[PDB]
Amino acid sequence: XXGSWSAXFEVXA
Secondary structure (H helix, E strand, O other), rough: OOOOOOOOOOOOO
16 A cells, blocks of 8 residues: 555555
C-alpha cells in the first residue's frame, strides 16, 4: 500500500 519517505510507512501495512 502507501508509505512515506522518512521512517516507517503511514498506512501501517
